[PDB]
Design a protein around this ligand. Structure first.
Ligand code: MG
Length: 434
């Protein structure tokens, strides 16, 4: 019979922030299920009396009038033929006041609705993993300017849920996703808004890609670890051969845990349209320029194999936190299709790990959101590290959702803040099929 295997509410509920219940449904569908939201009839009624709201949807966004009230969700699982046993769940917390403003509030004016069939609204966002943000070092050395409550996972997830669902996007590529964030925050929020997701963890965090089901279906997945592909896959034998005279650089590349997530999607709107969506988080060290070049060379060879060998020539979207600014060898290589043997990034970490080589690729990739002043803004550092790279053979930029202003970014010195849930800024752009 239709039954909710998991039924959970968030612990932190804020006025103006969507309440996205976790509902794992067996033998049924949410479109076939019944939802009704209630609010406490009066503050402090200890849940003795409940007032029906007019909200019959899975998601409820409390108003300022609900501050001080608990909420209750009634849900009846259904499969389109019959209902299962009804369930009810009350919030343990009362609705609280949320932040006055968020950096994404103005950005949401550019993403008012789900886009037409000819477009692909694409997001790339490093959402700052709680595995790193939870530490004393993050709170006192990295982000001392941030209100400690605003670093806490439950607070940041509320903002990230509002931010991402507010973009009404089609393809969402995320980095620094914790295992529990994927299953308890992103999957319930994004599935309520019509997106399905896949997760590729490294150790305690990793990559996620979400896609809008009304526009896409997932065909296949081709995720890799760069070290595994480079050392063991004969596809990368020529690059491994270039690294034979540089054993110190080769050992440092092969130590890295960096992964590449690859998902091939099929348009539910045009039968002839498939797209290869790649997502990554490259090695982070400031002196790791040569490592990022080699990781990018593996990534592009892997994506070429998936998109042109496994599939008979499909276009590509490559999102990620590339930990590379536009002045680097890695960025030049992506945009120009080659990098010379004498590039200074081949000795980015000194002579011992020097690995001068010539690399070439035949993709025609454009940074969809261009080269912002920065996509990462913290105390002591800022830089453009994130990109949405698009295949110019098949895609064009319809619009770029502007990044928050510098005044918005610096209201609480830097990021994250009470108004911005990550140390990175989400990239959002509308792409058009050519
Ligand atoms: Mg980070």
């Amino acid at each position: 019979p239709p039954a909710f295997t998991e039924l959970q509410l968030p612990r932190y509920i804020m006025a103006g922030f969507p309440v996205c219940p976790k509902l794992s449904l067996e033998f049924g569908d949410p479109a076939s299920s019944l939802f009704r939201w209630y609010k406490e009839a009066k503050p402090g009624a200890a849940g003795s009396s409940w007032t029906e709201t007019d909200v019959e949807e899975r998601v409820y966004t409390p108003s300022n009038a609900d501050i001080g009230l608990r909420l209750k969700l009634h849900c009846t699982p259904g499969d389109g033929q019959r209902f299962g046993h009804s369930r009810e769940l009350e919030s343990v917390c009362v609705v609280e006041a949320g932040p006055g403003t968020c950096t994404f509030d103005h950005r949401h004016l550019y993403t008012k609705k789900v886009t037409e069939d000819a477009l692909i609204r694409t997001v790339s966002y490093n959402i700052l993993a709680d595995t790193y943000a939870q530490t004393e070092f993050s709170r006192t050395v990295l982000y001392p300017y941030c209100a400690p409550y605003a670093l806490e996972l439950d607070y940041r997830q509320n903002l990230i849920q509002k931010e991402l669902t507010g973009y009404n996007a089609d393809v969402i590529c995320l980095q620094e996703v914790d295992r529990a964030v994927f299953s308890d925050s992103l999957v319930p929020a994004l599935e309520a808004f019509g997106l399905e997701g896949v997760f590729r963890i490294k150790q305690h965090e990793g990559l996620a890609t979400f896609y809008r089901k009304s526009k896409f279906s997932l065909l296949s997945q081709h995720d890799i670890s760069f070290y595994e592909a480079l050392e063991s896959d004969p596809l990368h034998k020529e690059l491994l051969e270039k690294l034979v005279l540089y054993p110190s650089a080769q050992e440092k590349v092969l130590q890295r845990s960096s992964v590449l997530q690859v998902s091939v999607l099929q348009s539910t709107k045009d039968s002839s349209k498939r797209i290869c969506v790649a997502n990554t988080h490259l090695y982070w060290h400031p002196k790791g320029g040569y490592i990022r070049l080699i990781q990018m060379a593996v990534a592009l060879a892997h994506i070429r194999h998936v998109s042109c060998d496994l599939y008979p020539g499909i276009p590509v979207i490559f999102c990620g936190d590339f930990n590379s600014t536009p002045s680097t060898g890695m960025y030049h290589f992506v945009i120009n299709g080659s990098i010379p043997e004498d590039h200074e990034d081949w000795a980015s970490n000194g002579e011992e790990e020097r690995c001068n080589m010539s690399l070439t690729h035949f993709f025609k990739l454009k940074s969809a959101c261009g080269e912002p002043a920065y996509t990462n803004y913290v105390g002591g550092f800022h830089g453009c590290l994130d990109y949405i790279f698009i295949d110019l053979n098949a895609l064009e930029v319809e619009q770029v959702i502007p990044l928050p202003s510098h005044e918005e970014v610096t209201t609480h010195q830097a990021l994250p803040s009470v108004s911005h849930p990550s140390d990175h800024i989400a990239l959002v752009c509308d792409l058009k099929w050519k």
